[PDB]
Amino acid sequence: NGFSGADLTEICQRACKLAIRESIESEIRRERERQTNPSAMEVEEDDPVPEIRRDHFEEAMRFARRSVSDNDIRKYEMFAQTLQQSRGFGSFRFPS
Amino acid sequence: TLLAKAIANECQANFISIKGPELLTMWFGESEANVREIFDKARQAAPCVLFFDELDSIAKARGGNIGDGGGAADRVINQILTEMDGMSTKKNVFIIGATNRPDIIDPAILRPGRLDQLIYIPLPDE
Fold first, then answer.
1. A87 and B123 in contact by Cβ < 8 A?
2. Which family does it belong to (chain B)?
3. Distance CA B90, CA B87 (A)
4. B66, B76, B100, B109 — which has fewest CB within 10 A?
5. How many domains does chain B have?
């Protein structure tokens, strides 16, 4: 609803971090699996997680946070309306 | 005040105006029970439009904006809140409030069942 650009960047970075950790842990285990039980025929199934999925983004969004509170946005709105173009000329018309 | 009177006139409803001096008199004299009598009068005159002009007078009297050490609550406004909460079945009586200092007004005034509808009366246009 009100995430800042930094907040969205943090969410994306956290999702990427979760994906990277899962991929590293999985391929590490899979390597134990060949070392523990040497398979007769080598057939790598490629990467167990080749791209960022829905579950990674859901877990990352679980930690999503709004860095910018609504009170500081209220102060900015105050200053913005502190550069108020008056309140009596909005209907200015030349005499014709 | 004229806007409230006009709205009362359109509906052909009696109009009762409680100015700031009356509220300040009830506050200084520590006689806030007369607010109950005011509301009873509103009930007797129903349908009626009970208008509390310049409702912020008591808040100003206690210090304006800085106020005293206490909060926004005061005897007269508290009696008004009690009567307004109990003044729900009547339907006829309509409560209109006016205040030139909305910032110092008691927040409890604006809670549901109270003067919820805030209307900004700006300076007249051309």
1. yes
2. Belongs to the AAA ATPase family.
3. 6
4. B66
5. 1
Rounded to 5 degrees, what angle do the CA atoms B122, B102, A79 make? 75
Task: Tell whether B37 is covered by a domain.
Answer: yes
Residue with tokens 């005061």: B74
Evaluated on CA atoms B63, B67, B69, B74, the torsion sign reads positive
- Please report, for the domain that includes residue B55, its CATH number: 3.40.50.300
- Domain hosting B51: range is 1-120
Phi, psi dihedral angles at B53 (to 5 degrees):
-70, 140
Question: Which residues of chain B have a CB within 8 Å of the CB of A88?
Answer: 123
Instruction: Extract the annotated binding site of B.
Output: 1-2
Distance from CA of B125 to the nearest CA of A (A): 7
DSSP secondary structure letter of residue A62: H
Scan residues 105-124 of B and list those with Cβ closer than 8 Å to A. 122-123
Which resolution in angstroms does this entry have? 3.0
* Contacts of range B61-64, beta carbons closer than 8 Å, 24 or more positions apart: B61/B24, B61/B27, B64/B101, B64/B104
Cβ-defined contacts of A56-59 (< 8 Å, 24+):
A56/A15, A56/A18, A56/A19, A56/A22, A57/A11, A57/A15, A59/A15, A59/A18
Tell me the two tokens of residue A12.
Answer: 């994306």
User: Does a structural domain hold residue B126?
Assistant: no
CB contact under 8 A, B122 and A91: no
Domains and CATH numbers, chain A: 1-79 (6.10.20.150)
Q: Which residue on chain A is closest to B125 by alpha carbon?
A: A88
